[PDB]
Amino acid sequence: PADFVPDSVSGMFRSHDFSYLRLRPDHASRPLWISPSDGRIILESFSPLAEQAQDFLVTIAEPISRPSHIHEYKITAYSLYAAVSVGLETDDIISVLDRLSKVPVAESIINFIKGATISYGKVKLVIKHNRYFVETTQADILQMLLNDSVIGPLRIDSDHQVQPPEDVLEREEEDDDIDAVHSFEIANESVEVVKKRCQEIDYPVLEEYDFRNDHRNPDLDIDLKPSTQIRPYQEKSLSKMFGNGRARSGIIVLPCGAGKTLVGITAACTIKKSVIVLCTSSVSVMQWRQQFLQWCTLQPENCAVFTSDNKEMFQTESGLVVSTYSMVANTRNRSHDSQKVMDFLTGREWGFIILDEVHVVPAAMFRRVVSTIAAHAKLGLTATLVREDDKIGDLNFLIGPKLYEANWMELSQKGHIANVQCAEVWCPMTAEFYQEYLRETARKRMLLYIMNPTKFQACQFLIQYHERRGDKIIVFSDNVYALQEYALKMGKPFIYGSTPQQERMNILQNFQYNDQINTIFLSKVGDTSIDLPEATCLIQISSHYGSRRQEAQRLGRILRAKRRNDEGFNAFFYSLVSKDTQEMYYSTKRQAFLVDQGYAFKVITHLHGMENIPNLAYASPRERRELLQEVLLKNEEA
DNA sequence: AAAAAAAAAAGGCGCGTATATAAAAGTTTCAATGTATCTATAAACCTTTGATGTGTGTTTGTACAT
């Protein structure tokens, strides 16, 4: 509602029917011919020079970049919406498609492309010279201010004001769209629904949140601080929040943890206003304050963070703020002095708000921040946008769709993010558990899946292989119930939820730079803390449907957060896939976007040498049939 | 009734009472010095007991097959 779904929907514009091709225009003109109606991308015989052409292709659709002449392409509806930042000559892309009119030129698609170039940069929501107003700016969304009632009748005929930009400032459209068809000064009351009304009245309107163009502020408790540096993937995001008129903001999809505070530093530094920051959990947040927050540009003293047990200095500093949603994303609240903090900052006209990895966060709890801050601008930072909660209003119509993707196979040609060759070992199955798996019921069937004799024979082989060629391991699995049994039946450490803080320390200290106790297991809450800077030998064993997304996201921090820049980087991933079992199809459906990312995958049902393992307990299958007798228990508890 | 041994008894040897003369040899007594031997005593440990952050725990809000 306030936000819009439009941030997780790539792979579109595929305009082609049972008779798509028109009289091949590019048939004669063969310098370049992408799939037009689709928006697909394909080179032409009068034109093979590719590498420099990365950017032009970046404007449209999805490639196949292990393609030879070129990679693939596609149309994208909101994709043109993103392109407005440059906002170049619209027909030029069509003019570029002029040669690329491969079939008879799909003017309809071209119009669709002209349409594909309709919204972004054609935004419409008024603003005024140190205030906000009820007008509109570009053709794509112009009326998204003027004809309105929360933007038009919620646009107030006030003439013009920077100093007069405050009383109203039908709430602060300080982040209004492109502005000023006759712009009626914006008010102070009711856009918390406008953001909902927007797509409700479906205005593809390009929000704009300025750098100094709202003098409801003698611009407030920030200031520019640029000390930072840049790896090859920054600047676009930074200038991505400028546009036309006055500045703006948006949403960006990233493998996070890359000093994303630093990019957060800039835009906040570049508005000098009131801003707050948010992260998941005192479980999660502390990987932020002090190894990647001070090599940067901020003074050492200001901010406060709040848990009323992990509390700070509140009622104290005029400067900026930082908190957690789930803290107040709920009627959860520890010390009523929280409501000594709650009321203002909630009610406070924050210039900007920072939300981070809201991906897992549900509307059923995510709407609180929507109902909490309503800051004049917002930060969009999560893991993945194609989702399971693909529901109606994603945070876009609040902030925007994804602004910057990542880049993996050919920009990382500046910085190698950990060359991957994924492995899935296709271990067959025995009916012995499986027979009563044919007798099972609700997901307590899946426990039987965990009862596979094959995992063991391979499990050590993985440990053996890794150390037979001598590189240490990081493993992935689930369902601790017996997976914990696996651990100290693997000769390897056990890790489990519902665990005291004390014991968490003994895991790493005489363990990291040592070279002997070189194996690890993972829980379902421990993954919410950290992964080692070591052992990119990545082995999946056990997972679970739906979690697949975050499970796949869970795999992310290992490699992408790594940045070392060697020649090859012979790194690999591995996984356990017990054959003839309920999940692998869903795992293939999980695999369905594995090499989507270009980070590839190779399969081995059996390698050269899996059986080389003589230390496996249950070497003969009667212990595996002893296992059957233990296999009963929990599934006889079940 | 007669023989033998000890006491009853005194007077005097011979130097204590002074007593100073002086030398000659030696003693003992007094006080500073040295040392193992009591003790308290406060500074060592060990255990106790009252105050204490907090690991685990009752409500909130959750992807997720079911």
What residue type is assigned to position A394 of the chain?
A: D
Annotated ligand binding at A258? The verdict is yes
Q: Pick out the nucleotide with least CA–C1' distance to A502.
A: B55
Annotated ligand binding at A196? The verdict is no
Residue A505, CB, strand B, below 7 Å? no
C-alpha A400/C-alpha A397 separation (Å) is 5
Exposed e or buried b per residue across A65-81, where buried means at least 16 C-beta atoms within 10 angstroms of its C-beta: beeeebbbbbbbbbbbb
Q: Pick out the nucleotide with least CA–C1' distance to A366.
A: B61
Tell me which residue of A384, A306, A373 sits closest to A593, measured CA to CA: A384
- Partners of A132 in beta bridges: A127
| A175 alpha carbon, distance to own chain's centre | 23
Q: Pick out the nucleotide with least CA–C1' distance to A329.
A: B61
Q: How far is the CA of A556 from the C1' of B19 (A)?
A: 132
Q: How far is the CA of A44 from the C1' of B45 (A)?
A: 92
Q: Pick out the nucleotide with least CA–C1' distance to A326.
A: B61
Residue A501, CB, strand B, below 7 Å? yes
Annotated ligand binding at A53? The verdict is no
φ/ψ region of A145 (left if φ > 0, alpha if ψ in -120 to 50, else beta) reads alpha
φ/ψ region of A225 (left if φ > 0, alpha if ψ in -120 to 50, else beta) reads beta
Residue A281, CB, strand B, below 7 Å? no
Crossing angle, helix A90-99 and helix A107-116, to 10 degrees? 150
Q: Which of residues 532-591 of A touch strand B (CB under 7 A)?
A: 544-547, 550
3-state secondary structure at position A251: strand
Annotated ligand binding at A268? The verdict is no
The structure's method of determination equals cryo-EM
Ordered alpha helix ranges (H), A479-568: 480-487, 548-554, 556-559
Annotated ligand binding at A259? The verdict is yes
Q: How far is the CA of A527 from the C1' of B55 (A)?
A: 21
Ordered alpha helix ranges (H), A308-437: 325-328, 337-347, 363-370, 431-437
Residue A500, CB, strand B, below 7 Å? yes
For A127, the token pair is 């603003």
Q: How far is the CA of A501 from the C1' of B49 (A)?
A: 28
Annotated ligand binding at A526? The verdict is no
Q: How far is the CA of A525 from the C1' of B63 (A)?
A: 15
C-alpha A401/C-alpha A4 separation (Å) is 8
Annotated ligand binding at A67? The verdict is no
φ/ψ region of A276 (left if φ > 0, alpha if ψ in -120 to 50, else beta) reads beta
C-alpha A128/C-alpha A183 separation (Å) is 7
Exposed e or buried b per residue across A6-44, where buried means at least 16 C-beta atoms within 10 angstroms of its C-beta: bbbbbebbebbeeeebbeebbeebeebbbbbbbbbbbbb
Residue A388, CB, strand B, below 7 Å? yes
Phi, psi of A590, rounded to the nearest 5 degrees: -70, -45
Residue A446, CB, strand B, below 7 Å? yes
Residue A332, CB, strand B, below 7 Å? yes
Q: Pick out the nucleotide with least CA–C1' distance to A361.
A: B62
